[PDB]
Design a protein around this motif. Structure first.
Motif: not given
Lengths: 130, 130
Positions: A72, A74, A80, A100, A102, A120-122, B37, B39-40, B42, B73, B75, B77, B79, B81, B83, B103, B105, B117, B119, B121
């Protein structure tokens, strides 16, 4: 300035990072890059480069790949890019840890390189490699 | 319901309810079919999400969590985001807080303006110090 142009750029960026061709980092990364990956922070491309060099010694035969799934762009020109981070050891390929992730990217006005990169990840799952 | 500061304000309220563990009030700001969501982790549907947080309170009893925004932020759509920072502490050892960048989402539902939704991270490795 389109969301598909952004994803295309992110793909190229990770292609260079995942290749560990440290000389080609200057191509897509600004010299004053503010990188943030969890509690890891680096100012300038030089410190960023030494931090990845450090990681290749800590886990020798480290193989990493990234795959985009949703990007996406902005108004401010912030990318993002949600995706997946993969890591594996040459010692034991086909044991792949995948999480996962971002990317938050902000581009530089003139050259079109990345001046702000926050990932950002685990990181806990990647312990299965150490 | 469509300015960046309005979004951050909403995210703050959302985390206020989550961090309060008042599982009954989750339905207020979260859709019933929430795809979460982390990390691992869901979960499909608000019910499975609720049982997954209940699970976490047994796994670490006396867990206290807080979130602080720093850059949000909105967007085209719709969405969000956001942080920020994720804080965790144990009743056992108060005054000792682990903090990591994070962050959110969020994608909203067209009609009610709840989250369908979510998510999240963050690096979970540093919370091992607890």
């Amino acid at each position: 300035q389109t969301p598909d142009q952004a994803e295309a750029f992110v793909a190229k960026v990770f292609d260079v990072l995942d290749s560990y061709d440290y000389t080609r980092f200057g191509e897509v990364l600004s010299t004053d890059l503010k990188y943030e990956g969890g509690l890891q922070k680096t100012s300038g491309l030089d410190n960023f480069i030494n931090d990845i060099k450090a990681s290749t010694q800590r886990m020798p035969g480290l193989q990493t790949s990234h795959s985009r799934y949703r990007t996406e762009l902005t108004a401010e020109g912030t990318i993002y890019s949600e995706g997946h981070s993969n890591a594996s050891l040459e010692s034991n390929p086909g044991k792949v840890v995948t999480v996962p992730m971002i990317g938050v990217f902000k581009l530089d006005s003139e050259d079109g390189k990345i001046k702000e990169m926050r990932i950002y990840k685990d990181r806990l799952p990647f312990l299965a490699l150490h």
